[PDB]
């Protein structure tokens, strides 16, 4: 659950290392295609909030400040429309 | 400093040595000697340690996403 209220600092370090290796060993278009499927949308809602836009801004800035970008373009589109 | 720079680039040439008869004579020599050898050898270890591939020009094809922050 990507939220600064719940997760500790080591949890963000763990998620950063995990997603950096996931973006490394398989491609960012393939990572976006894996995260963008309709079947696993209830399984990514704690990771990709799209609700309470302070938390959505935190998730967008988190995935940008890791060094990824890209994955949060749909979340940036959803934030910009609201 | 520009005049000294002109004399300095006039100094730094190849100038392959003349065969000199007799004993050799010491010519004009330096750098920062007191205490800078530690950071100099640290720079040597960093140069032996740092690994980076490709050309130096790699800033192209970067979307460069900025942080949204808060209003």
């Amino acid at each position: 659950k990507l939220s600064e209220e719940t997760t500790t600092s080591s949890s963000r370090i763990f998620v950063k290392i995990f997603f950096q290796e996931l973006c490394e060993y398989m491609g960012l278009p393939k990572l976006n295609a894996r995260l963008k499927d309709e079947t696993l949308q209830p399984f990514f809602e704690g990771l990709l909030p799209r609700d309470n836009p302070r938390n959505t801004r935190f998730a967008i800035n988190f995935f940008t400040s890791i060094g990824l970008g890209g994955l949060t373009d749909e979340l940036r589109e959803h934030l910009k429309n609201t | 400093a520009a005049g000294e720079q002109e004399k300095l680039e006039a100094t730094n040439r190849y100038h392959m040595p003349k065969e000199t008869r007799g004993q050799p004579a010491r010519a004009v020599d330096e750098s920062g000697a007191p205490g800078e050898e530690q950071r100099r050898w640290e720079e040597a270890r960093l140069g032996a340690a740092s690994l980076k591939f490709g050309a130096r020009d790699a800033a192209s094809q970067e979307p460069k996403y900025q942080l949204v922050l808060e209003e």
Binding site: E4, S9, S10, R12, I13, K16, I17, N61, F62, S65, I66 | L67, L69
Partner: peptide
């Protein structure tokens, strides 16, 4: 060495510190 370990985790990869640095860059 728990205190030095929390010092290393506050000096870790730390996206929160990047948020703080970019917020002070944008504010000032």
């Amino acid at each position: 060495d728990l205190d030095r370990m929390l010092r290393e985790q506050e000096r870790e990869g730390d996206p929160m510190a990047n948020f703080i640095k970019k917020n002070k860059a944008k504010e000032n």
